[PDB]
Amino acid sequence: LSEVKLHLDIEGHASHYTIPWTELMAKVPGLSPEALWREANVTEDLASMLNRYKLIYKTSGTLGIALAEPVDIPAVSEGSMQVDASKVHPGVISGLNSPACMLSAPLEKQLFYYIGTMLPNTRPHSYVFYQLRCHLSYVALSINGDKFQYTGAMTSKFLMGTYKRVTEKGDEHVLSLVFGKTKDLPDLRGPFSYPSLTSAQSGDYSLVIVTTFVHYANFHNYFVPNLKDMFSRAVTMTAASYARYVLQKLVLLEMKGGCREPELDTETLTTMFEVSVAFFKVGHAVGETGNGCVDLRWLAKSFFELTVLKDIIGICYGATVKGMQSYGLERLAAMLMATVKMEELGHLTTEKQEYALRLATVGYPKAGVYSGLIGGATSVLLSAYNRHPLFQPLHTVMRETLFIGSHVVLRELRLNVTTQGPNLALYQLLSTALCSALEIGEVLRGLALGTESGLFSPCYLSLRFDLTRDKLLSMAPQEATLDQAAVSNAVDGFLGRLSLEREDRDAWHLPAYKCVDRLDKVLMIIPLINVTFIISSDREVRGSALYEASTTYLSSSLFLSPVIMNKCSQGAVAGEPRQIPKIQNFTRTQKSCIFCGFALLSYDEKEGLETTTYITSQEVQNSILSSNYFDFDNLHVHYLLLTTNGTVMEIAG
Amino acid sequence: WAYPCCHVTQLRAQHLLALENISDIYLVSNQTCDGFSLASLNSPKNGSNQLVISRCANGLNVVSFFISILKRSSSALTGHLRELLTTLETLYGSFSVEDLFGANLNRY
């Protein structure tokens, strides 16, 4: 008790060291020598110990390479208003452009609020590591109905995910991966040496494989991870970047249908571990800089990629995440946003625009039940639309922006509190117009050629439910330079992520929604200022009047039901639909904004609906009548005009 | 170059020694006995050093334990309790487990 001394023997000499754990227990909290001494079978007869070790996988080809960690967190700026995460001031303490950062000491303690067990009591682990208990956070996963599960257990120093499968019988197979700075790896119990367990090693980073030979076998049949690249990328890559690299990897699997048919393959399993590493990276970042200060721009960006990540992880798999959200950072972000000209965010700069919407997503939860957050997301979008012709550059800096904003918009839509419904309905309208044949077309092109990940598109929130397996294949680019086979996958992928990112209730808000009987035959709805048009293949909509295009090439007919004053009458229109009158009156050059609060809808005689446009302002109308948006010298394509009134007309002048 | 080695046996259905009564621990070298990382747990009985009880333990396991405690509380130790770790770790890695597969474990 208290005092204990051991004797050694270096070279021909007897060394004498005395270890008084009595004094140590005072200066240390979690150090309970009594337990650890028992954990390690001191009287484990020579023979029995051996098998307790040989029944453990051996990282035969323990390989490593040069991988110096990249520069992540920037050095706090000038008068950066450094705030505590534990408690936010009853008022504001910043502006919008003012420098700011958060204290690590509190932020970390808030993230890793939960306490746990990095090392469970399962047979495999209990043989190698010493029962450990510290603040952590994990990522729960369950596929094939609890027949397979993954756990992203991580602490401020190291991550340790574990795989768990079950054969038809009570057979339980487990294999885990341990990532983190070599110096931080847990304590090994019996005759174990990390080298014979490490798979990849850097100058200070390691990747350990803890599992039994019996298990490694059942796993090697469907899980052969590329430890090499999987390790490097997990080391040499900024937190924010790694987060998206994973987010994209998932989007791919989503388009592969792996979100309804969760394939138990190397790829799917690999992404899982990386998903937790993405979260670990962020936590390990705030850790390295203890008692330091992380720039708010860094968090708004890093923590953003995590929020977006957590959602897809949940929508796809019934996975859960806890131990990485700090109510502090949320209150701060929330307050900061509440102090900015939201309705004028679009007139701001690009870099500032992202940061704005970016953090707007992070703080949406903790506060902003009456803050004009959705408004800002609209303003920024509005600007984007006005500057172009219903299509955003495939890889523009702003494209990334609209993606960040959509999140704070979707979240809003999912709710049942009709707040800013009019301001929100607009967002849908715009995005819908943006989901033009040009857009949907280019997106596919990129998907096939593998240039575009397909992470975001204004369609995901648009009210264009016209694109189907076949219809989508129509907008696809017709070129021999594109593998007809590859194209199909793209079309399929897009259709997939579209059915997951977009829900049927995304429109339970729109006033006119309540007016559609056979809503399944609805091509697309156009929310206007004083009215709302419903394009469908059924004359069941109970609007104010019924319009029908001259084309009958399609399977069914092309109807146009306008709900005046967003309130519908009882019963559909009388027999015989009203025919769309043809007009050639209007002249190209236009002084004022004639078709202002109106919208344009072009459809191909053979295929479905092509592109739709909402002329926001004067500048837009000009960039349409001047450009070659029109092509009356094509009998196949027609151009319709929906006005503030339930009237519709074709153009050809 | 050390002390007598032994034949480590488990104590089935009885009771063991705790840290509470032990205070001396003798360790061996990667060549003294025969590759076997052995340790001796010495603890005085009754009052002081009258009759000393000395039983065998598994070196590797013991050493690992100590190596762990030292690391788990680095924030509260300097002097010997810091060099002891680095030297104790090198010792731990001086033994070869995989050799015991073919080696006779009843040599003592």
User: Would you call B84 and A19 a contact, using CB atoms and an 8 Å cutoff?
Assistant: yes
Distance of CA A341 to the CA centre of its chain: 27
- Choose the closest CB to B65 out of A36, A46, A49: A36
Method: X-ray
Distance of CA A400 to the CA centre of its chain: 12
B102: three-class secondary structure by DSSP: coil
A120: three-class secondary structure by DSSP: coil
Q: Which of A2, A4, A6, A126 to mutate to test the interface with B (most CBs of B within 10 A)?
A: A6
Take residue A3 and report the two structure tokens written for it.
């005092």
> Torsion angle of alpha carbons B52, B56, B60, B62, nearest 10°?
-40
Sequence letter at residue A85: A
| HSE toward the beta carbon, residue A584, CA cutoff 13 A | 3
Take residue A121 and report the two structure tokens written for it.
């009591």
What residues of A are in contact with residue B55 (Cβ under 8 Å)? 43
> Torsion angle of alpha carbons A32, A34, A39, A45, nearest 10°?
150
CA-to-CA distance for A434 and A457, rounded, in angstroms? 9
**Cα-Cα end-to-end distance for chain B:** 17
| HSE toward the beta carbon, residue A170, CA cutoff 13 A | 0
Q: Which of B25, B26, B82 to mutate to test the interface with A (most CBs of A within 10 A)?
A: B25
Quick check: B14 contacting A, CB < 8 Å?
no
CA-to-CA distance for A542 and A544, rounded, in angstroms? 7
Distance from CA of A9 to the nearest CA of B (A): 7
CA-to-CA distance for A321 and A165, rounded, in angstroms? 20
Q: What angle do CA A85, A87, A91 make, to 5 degrees?
A: 110
The sign of the dihedral angle between the CA atoms of A109, A112, A115, A118 is: negative
B38: three-class secondary structure by DSSP: strand
Q: For the domain B1-108, what is the CATH code?
A: 3.10.390.20
User: Would you call B1 and A9 a contact, using CB atoms and an 8 Å cutoff?
Assistant: yes
Q: What angle do CA A406, A411, A417 make, to 5 degrees?
A: 125
What residues of A are in contact with residue B1 (Cβ under 8 Å)? 9, 12
- Choose the closest CB to B61 out of A3, A34, A40: A40
Integer angstrom CA distances of residue A27 from A18, A36, A157, A502, B77: 17, 17, 21, 56, 10
| Residue A310: other Cβ atoms inside 10 A | 19
Quick check: B82 contacting A, CB < 8 Å?
no
Sequence letter at residue A40: A
Locate the DSSP E strands across A204-253. Answer: 205-211
| Helix and strand numbers, DSSP H then E, in chain B | 2, 3
Burial of A176 by CB count in 10 Å (0-12 exposed, 13-18 middle, 19+ buried)? buried
CA-to-CA distance for A198 and A190, rounded, in angstroms? 16
What residues of B are in contact with residue A19 (Cβ under 8 Å)? 66, 69-70, 81, 84
Show the domains of chain A with their CATH numbers: 1-325 (3.90.380.20), 326-653 (no CATH)
Sequence letter at residue A59: T
> Torsion angle of alpha carbons B61, B66, B72, B74, nearest 10°?
-150
| Residue A315: other Cβ atoms inside 10 A | 15
What residues of B are in contact with residue A189 (Cβ under 8 Å)? 61, 64
User: Would you call B16 and A43 a contact, using CB atoms and an 8 Å cutoff?
Assistant: yes
Distance from CA of B51 to the nearest CA of A (A): 18
Q: Where are the domains of chain B?
A: 1-108
A65: three-class secondary structure by DSSP: coil
Asked whether A161 and A152 are in contact (CB, 8 A), the reply is yes
Task: Sheet containing A293-295: give its strands across.
Answer: A81-83, A100-103, A293-295
Integer angstrom CA distances of residue A443 from A170, A292, A391, A460: 47, 43, 10, 12
Q: Find the length of chain B.
A: 108
Closest residue in B to A133 (Cα–Cα) = B72
Q: Which of A323, A206, A317, A207 is nearest to A259 (CA)?
A: A317
Q: Which of B21, B33, B38, B61 to mutate to test the interface with A (most CBs of A within 10 A)?
A: B61
- Any idea which residue has 């788990």 for tokens? B72
CA-to-CA distance for A629 and A623, rounded, in angstroms? 9
Asked whether A183 and A47 are in contact (CB, 8 A), the reply is no
A302: three-class secondary structure by DSSP: helix
Q: What is the DSSP letter of A69?
A: P
Closest residue in A to B19 (Cα–Cα) = A1
